[PDB]
Enzyme design. Structure first.
Site, PDB file in Angstrom:
ATOM      1  N   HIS A 176     -19.609  19.618  -6.837  1.00 51.19           N
ATOM      2  CA  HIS A 176     -20.834  19.515  -6.232  1.00 51.19           C
ATOM      3  C   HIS A 176     -21.699  20.877  -6.053  1.00 51.19           C
ATOM      4  O   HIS A 176     -22.769  20.846  -5.837  1.00 51.19           O
ATOM      5  CB  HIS A 176     -20.769  18.817  -4.927  1.00 51.19           C
ATOM      6  CG  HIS A 176     -19.881  19.106  -3.733  1.00 51.19           C
ATOM      7  ND1 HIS A 176     -20.016  20.186  -2.894  1.00 51.19           N
ATOM      8  CD2 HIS A 176     -18.540  18.811  -3.787  1.00 51.19           C
ATOM      9  CE1 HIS A 176     -18.672  20.216  -2.156  1.00 51.19           C
ATOM     10  NE2 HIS A 176     -17.987  19.526  -2.798  1.00 51.19           N
ATOM     11  N   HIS A 194     -21.913  29.330  -1.146  1.00 50.03           N
ATOM     12  CA  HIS A 194     -22.184  28.358  -1.833  1.00 50.03           C
ATOM     13  C   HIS A 194     -23.666  28.448  -2.010  1.00 50.03           C
ATOM     14  O   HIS A 194     -24.165  28.773  -1.080  1.00 50.03           O
ATOM     15  CB  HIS A 194     -21.638  27.148  -1.951  1.00 50.03           C
ATOM     16  CG  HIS A 194     -21.930  26.392  -0.871  1.00 50.03           C
ATOM     17  ND1 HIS A 194     -21.261  26.573   0.318  1.00 50.03           N
ATOM     18  CD2 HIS A 194     -23.052  25.554  -0.577  1.00 50.03           C
ATOM     19  CE1 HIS A 194     -21.738  25.716   1.230  1.00 50.03           C
ATOM     20  NE2 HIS A 194     -22.946  24.993   0.746  1.00 50.03           N
ATOM     21  N   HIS A 244     -27.276  25.568  -3.084  1.00 45.58           N
ATOM     22  CA  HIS A 244     -28.024  24.468  -3.472  1.00 45.58           C
ATOM     23  C   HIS A 244     -29.126  24.906  -4.472  1.00 45.58           C
ATOM     24  O   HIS A 244     -29.755  25.750  -4.122  1.00 45.58           O
ATOM     25  CB  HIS A 244     -28.282  23.709  -2.368  1.00 45.58           C
ATOM     26  CG  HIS A 244     -27.116  23.247  -1.477  1.00 45.58           C
ATOM     27  ND1 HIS A 244     -26.411  22.144  -1.355  1.00 45.58           N
ATOM     28  CD2 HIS A 244     -26.747  23.955  -0.364  1.00 45.58           C
ATOM     29  CE1 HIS A 244     -25.465  22.268  -0.723  1.00 45.58           C
ATOM     30  NE2 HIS A 244     -25.567  23.441  -0.068  1.00 45.58           N
ATOM     31  N   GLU A 257     -32.322  22.959   0.686  1.00 48.99           N
ATOM     32  CA  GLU A 257     -32.095  21.735   1.656  1.00 48.99           C
ATOM     33  C   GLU A 257     -32.979  21.976   2.992  1.00 48.99           C
ATOM     34  O   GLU A 257     -33.828  21.014   2.962  1.00 48.99           O
ATOM     35  CB  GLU A 257     -30.477  21.824   1.933  1.00 48.99           C
ATOM     36  CG  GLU A 257     -29.601  21.574   0.824  1.00 48.99           C
ATOM     37  CD  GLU A 257     -28.256  20.954   1.221  1.00 48.99           C
ATOM     38  OE1 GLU A 257     -27.793  21.899   2.194  1.00 48.99           O
ATOM     39  OE2 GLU A 257     -27.805  20.314   0.578  1.00 48.99           O
ATOM     40  N   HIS A 312     -25.870  29.384   1.163  1.00 47.23           N
ATOM     41  CA  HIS A 312     -25.417  28.977   2.530  1.00 47.23           C
ATOM     42  C   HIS A 312     -24.031  29.767   2.590  1.00 47.23           C
ATOM     43  O   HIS A 312     -22.885  29.691   1.980  1.00 47.23           O
ATOM     44  CB  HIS A 312     -24.710  27.637   2.563  1.00 47.23           C
ATOM     45  CG  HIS A 312     -25.877  26.652   2.876  1.00 47.23           C
ATOM     46  ND1 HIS A 312     -25.675  25.268   2.493  1.00 47.23           N
ATOM     47  CD2 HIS A 312     -27.244  27.035   3.007  1.00 47.23           C
ATOM     48  CE1 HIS A 312     -26.972  24.568   2.788  1.00 47.23           C
ATOM     49  NE2 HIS A 312     -27.853  25.626   3.132  1.00 47.23           N
ATOM     50  N   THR A 324     -23.901  19.707   5.345  1.00 42.41           N
ATOM     51  CA  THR A 324     -25.147  19.020   4.373  1.00 42.41           C
ATOM     52  C   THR A 324     -24.466  18.183   3.323  1.00 42.41           C
ATOM     53  O   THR A 324     -25.108  17.382   2.505  1.00 42.41           O
ATOM     54  CB  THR A 324     -26.144  20.032   3.953  1.00 42.41           C
ATOM     55  OG1 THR A 324     -25.529  20.724   2.948  1.00 42.41           O
ATOM     56  CG2 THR A 324     -26.627  20.650   5.064  1.00 42.41           C
ATOM     57  N   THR A 325     -22.958  18.410   3.405  1.00 42.68           N
ATOM     58  CA  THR A 325     -22.164  17.571   2.437  1.00 42.68           C
ATOM     59  C   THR A 325     -21.187  16.613   2.991  1.00 42.68           C
ATOM     60  O   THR A 325     -20.815  16.886   4.143  1.00 42.68           O
ATOM     61  CB  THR A 325     -21.430  18.183   1.374  1.00 42.68           C
ATOM     62  OG1 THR A 325     -20.743  19.297   1.822  1.00 42.68           O
ATOM     63  CG2 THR A 325     -22.402  18.855   0.420  1.00 42.68           C
TER      64      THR A 325
HETATM   65 ZN   LIG Z   1     -24.358  23.995   1.523  1.00 42.86          ZN
END
Ligand SMILES: [Zn+2]
Length: 258
Positions: free
Chosen positions: A62, A92, A94, A104, A117, A196-197
């Site tokens: 992901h 990581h 997004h 996000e 993040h 957020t996951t």
């Molecule tokens: Zn994140």
């Protein structure tokens, strides 16, 4: 039929496996800059990354995580809204399929091309797994990315991505200095939220920097060459791995600046 970012398993489906998806302090959120309240009681943020020890980079299906040795106080976040010491465990990103989306958090509904993040856990809980079960277990430093000039400190990350194209691949990634990913200013917004996951646990003090970093079109293009799938499976580009803004509900976003 695991969660993901596709049409049939994306963010609007997550609540079926993870009911907290519709909870009271979910992330990300839109940051309405005019409604955020300056908070004079906030202390300056302390980011101490000089002794950071990166170990490995992993494509987990992901995103990709740059992982750190968190068995000692080596790379820590303190101050700001936080009580105590939070240890860096991984960072990581997004990102989007297009420069006009990918972040996000949003700022007055504006989407950035990507969002970094830096994930830290509260040392009073002993390890990450225990920390995520606590309302003050994690502190995540969020940094927006816009497309423009290259970020030199990001290039070492971009260049190893070929070696971890597919889900489950990892590579040695030592001696990476995350200070090279920070903007000049540490002015921030802060609010209580969640991962957020999935599992979307409500354990995060969010600290989102006001100043984005710039990365080049070539840099973000290389993010977009990664795969969600494993090796030998049908290729699906790892793009648009972001959750959209969730309802603010009973929360106030605080600003460290005026
Ligand atoms: Zn994140």
């Amino acid at each position: 039929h695991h969660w993901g970012y596709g049409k049939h398993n994306g963010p609007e489906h997550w609540h079926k496996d993870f009911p907290i998806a519709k909870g009271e302090r979910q992330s990300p959120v839109d940051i309405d800059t005019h409604t955020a309240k300056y908070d004079p009681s906030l202390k300056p943020l302390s980011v101490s990354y000089d002794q950071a020890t990166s170990l490995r980079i992993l494509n987990n299906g992901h995103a990709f995580n740059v992982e750190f040795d968190d068995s000692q106080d080596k790379a820590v976040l303190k101050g700001g809204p936080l009580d105590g010491t939070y240890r860096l465990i991984q960072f990581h990103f997004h990102w989007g399929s297009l420069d006009g989306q990918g972040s996000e958090h949003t700022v007055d509904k504006k989407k950035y091309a990507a969002e970094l993040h830096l994930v830290h856990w509260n040392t009073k809980y002993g390890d990450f797994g225990k920390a995520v079960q606590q309302p003050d277990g994690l502190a995540i430093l969020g940094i927006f990315l816009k497309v423009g000039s290259a970020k030199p400190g990001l290039q070492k990350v971009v260049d190893v991505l070929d070696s971890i194209k597919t889900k489950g691949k990892s590579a040695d990634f030592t001696n990476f200095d995350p200070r090279g990913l920070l903007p000049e200013s540490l002015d921030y917004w802060t609010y209580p939220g969640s991962l957020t996951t999935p599992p979307l646990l409500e354990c995060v003090t969010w600290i989102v920097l006001k100043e984005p970093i710039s990365v080049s079109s070539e840099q973000v293009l290389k993010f977009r060459k990664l795969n969600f799938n494993g090796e030998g499976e049908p290729e699906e580009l790892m793009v648009d791995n972001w959750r959209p803004a969730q309802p603010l509900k009973n929360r106030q976003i605080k600003a460290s600046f005026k």
